[PDB]
Each structure stands twice: as structure tokens, then as C-alpha cells.
Design an enzyme around this catalytic site. Structure first.
Site, PDB file in Angstrom:
ATOM      1  N   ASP A 140     -15.461  61.196 -76.511  1.00 27.49           N
ATOM      2  CA  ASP A 140     -14.195  60.495 -76.667  1.00 27.49           C
ATOM      3  C   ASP A 140     -13.571  60.796 -78.040  1.00 27.49           C
ATOM      4  O   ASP A 140     -13.039  59.912 -78.697  1.00 27.49           O
ATOM      5  CB  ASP A 140     -14.442  58.996 -76.490  1.00 27.49           C
ATOM      6  N   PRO A 143      -7.736  60.847 -82.033  1.00 29.38           N
ATOM      7  CA  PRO A 143      -7.326  60.458 -83.383  1.00 29.38           C
ATOM      8  C   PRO A 143      -7.710  59.013 -83.775  1.00 29.38           C
ATOM      9  O   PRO A 143      -7.996  58.748 -84.942  1.00 29.38           O
ATOM     10  CB  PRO A 143      -5.806  60.640 -83.344  1.00 29.38           C
TER      11      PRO A 143
END
Ligand SMILES: Nc1ncnc2c1ncn2[C@@H]1O[C@H](COP(=O)(O)OP(=O)(O)OP(O)(O)=S)[C@@H](O)[C@H]1O
Ligand SMILES: [Mn+2]
Length: 274
Positions: A140, A143
Site C-alpha cells: 500500500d 503518498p
């Protein structure tokens, strides 16, 4: 309906300020009164906590949140569950980072300088290398899962738990996931901190997944000013569709980032634009 997050969890953690939220959780600064430690507590969101799907999902993810010991990885310290009059409220206790996510940096500041972006992503590669050496795929990388602290340390978090903007083509297709999937996703983050935009956007996650599988990213130097062809080569290698054509390890990706940072030619195949 009216669950609210208590001021104390389990008579050990005293919550202070709210730090952030995501699609499942609310994250609070807390004091561990037993160890005299400031920590971040990730709590199932109060507005979601009575919803069986969300409760059950939180518990399944809490027991899979990887606990790794590395300077660039947010440590996981404990898990628990508070009894409240509205029902159980599960939580995870982790290392507190005083800082900002890459998601929030790009939103508020726009693209990073290329040297800074290279530095941040090279540090993220070290975290991922360590994870991979310990048999853990992040899965996963995005940002929101990378922070820069107030002392400019990079911190990667939320490893090992199985948006569509950062998924690898193999995740989009339900194929096997490995270290190269983390390389691809980190390539997506690199693309975004360099250009201000993720590689692919769309009106639905199906449309974005389709693009990951089938469509070449616009070279970063075409998306945004001040970006070299050498950086195009590194980014587009990370984003190769076939895992065999990407960096095979996070260490290999780092090595090319380090070359570009030092003005040396990368090993990645050259990319020509007009
Ligand atoms: N260890 C931490 N220290 C300080 N802030 C944190 C920490 N972990 C998470 N945060 C903040 O809390 C927010 C929510 O974190 P998460 O629950 O992991 O959701 P997310 O990663 O932002 O997005 P989703 O739900 O996974 S799409 C982050 O975006 C940060 O703003
Ligand atoms: Mn997260």
C-alpha cells in the site's frame, strides 16, 4: 450513531490532539502514561465504528499491521480495544511522527524540487528494502503512507496489509504481488512528487486500474518543468508494466536514484521525447 472517541484509552493512553484521518481511522497524538512516551494512536473512526463491515475490517488489518524496527519505518507498539457505552473501539498504537505526509506536501506546496524528491524516495527505498529482507511486502505504498518529519527524516508506515491511483498492474489484475509491486507503487509516488500529479487519474477506480494495466504514463518531463531525461528513465523503469522490466529490488531503484542525484548516468533504459 453516536460513538465518540474517549479522552483515555485503556487507562494508559491519554489522547491529545487529532493528527489526521483516513478512510477507516482517526489518528490522535497520545501520551502513554505508563512509559512516558508520546505515541500516535490509530482508532477506528467514531462515525464508522458501529458499522460491522468497518469494525471487522479494522480488526483484520490491526492484527496484520507489520511491526518492523528501522529508522525509516514507523514502529507499531501495541493494539487494543476500548469498551465504550456505544460499543468496542479498536485501536493501534504506533510511533508518533511530528510531520507531514507526502500527500499533504504535494497538495499544499506542489511538486518538490527534483533533488528533494530523489532524496525522499531514496530513503523510502531503504525502508522497503528492509521490509523485503524481512519477508514483508508493503502492498500500500502511496503518498499518505510516507511522512517527512520536522527534522527532515523520512518515515514509511502501514506495511503488510492486503484508492487505485497507486496500485501495481498485478494488484489491479489479482495476480501475485511481490517486491516489484512496491517498486511500481513507489514509482507512482516519485512521479507525483516530481510532477505534482499521479501518473493516472480517472472518473472511476476501474478507469484508473485500466490505465495501470494498459496505458503508458506521460513521461515526467512532459508533465512538468525542470525534469531531466535521466529522471524520466528512472521513473519510467519503476513504472514498467511487466515486473521483469522494473527495478527488481528497492535497492536497485535506490542505486539509480543515487546516480541521478550525483549527476551520473542511470542504468535504466533511455527515454526519448519530442
Ligand atoms: N504514525 C503517524 N504519526 C503521525 N501522523 C500519522 C501517523 N499515521 C497516520 N498519520 C496521519 O493520519 C492520517 C490517516 O492515516 P491512515 O489511517 O493510515 O490513513 P491513510 O494512510 O491517510 O489513508 P487510507 O485510509 O489508508 S486511504 C495520515 O494521512 C496522517 O495524516
Ligand atoms: Mn496510512
Amino acid at each position: 450513531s453516536h460513538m465518540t472517541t474517549p479522552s483515555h484509552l485503556s487507562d494508559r493512553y491519554e489522547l491529545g490532539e487529532i493528527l489526521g484521518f483516513g478512510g477507516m481511522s482517526e489518528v490522535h497524538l497520545a501520551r502513554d502514561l505508563r512509559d512516558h512516551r508520546d505515541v500516535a494512536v490509530k482508532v477506528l473512526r467514531a462515525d464508522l465504528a458501529r458499522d460491522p463491515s468497518f469494525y471487522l475490517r479494522f480488526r483484520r488489518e490491526a492484527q496484520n499491521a507489520a511491526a518492523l524496527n528501522h529508522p525509516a519505518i514507523v514502529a507499531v507498539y501495541d493494539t487494543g480495544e476500548a469498551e465504550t457505552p456505544a460499543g468496542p473501539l479498536p485501536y493501534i498504537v504506533m510511533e508518533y511522527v511530528d510531520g507531514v505526509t507526502l500527500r499533504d506536501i504535494v497538495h499544499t506546496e506542489g511538486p518538490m524540487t527534483p533533488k528533494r524528491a530523489i532524496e525522499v524516495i531514496a530513503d523510502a527505498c531503504q525502508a522497503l528494502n528492509f521490509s523485503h529482507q524481512n519477508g514483508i511486502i508493503h502492498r500500500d505504498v502511496k503518498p499518505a503512507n510516507i511522512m517527512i518529519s520536522a527534522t527532515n527524516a523520512v518515515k514509511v508506515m502501514d506495511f503488510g496489509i492486503a484508492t487505485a491511483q497507486y496500485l501495481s498492474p498485478e494488484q489491479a489484475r489479482g495476480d501475485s504481488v511481490d517486491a516489484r509491486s512496491d517498486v511500481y507503487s513507489l514509482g507512482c509516488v516519485l512521479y507525483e512528487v516530481l510532477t505534482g500529479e499521479p501518473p493516472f487519474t480517472g472518473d472511476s477506480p476501474v478507469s484508473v486500474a485500466y490505465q495501470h494495466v494498459r496505458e503508458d504514463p506521460i513521461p515526467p518531463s512532459a508533465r512538468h518543468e525542470g525534469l531531466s531525461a535521466d529522471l524520466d528513465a528512472v521513473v519510467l523503469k519503476a513504472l514498467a508494466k511487466n515486473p521483469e522490466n522494473r527495478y527488481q529490488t528497492a535497492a536497485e531503484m535506490r542505486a539509480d536514484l543515487v546516480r541521478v542525484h550525483n549527476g551520473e548516468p542511470p542504468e535504466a533504459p533511455k527515454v526519448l521525447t519530442d
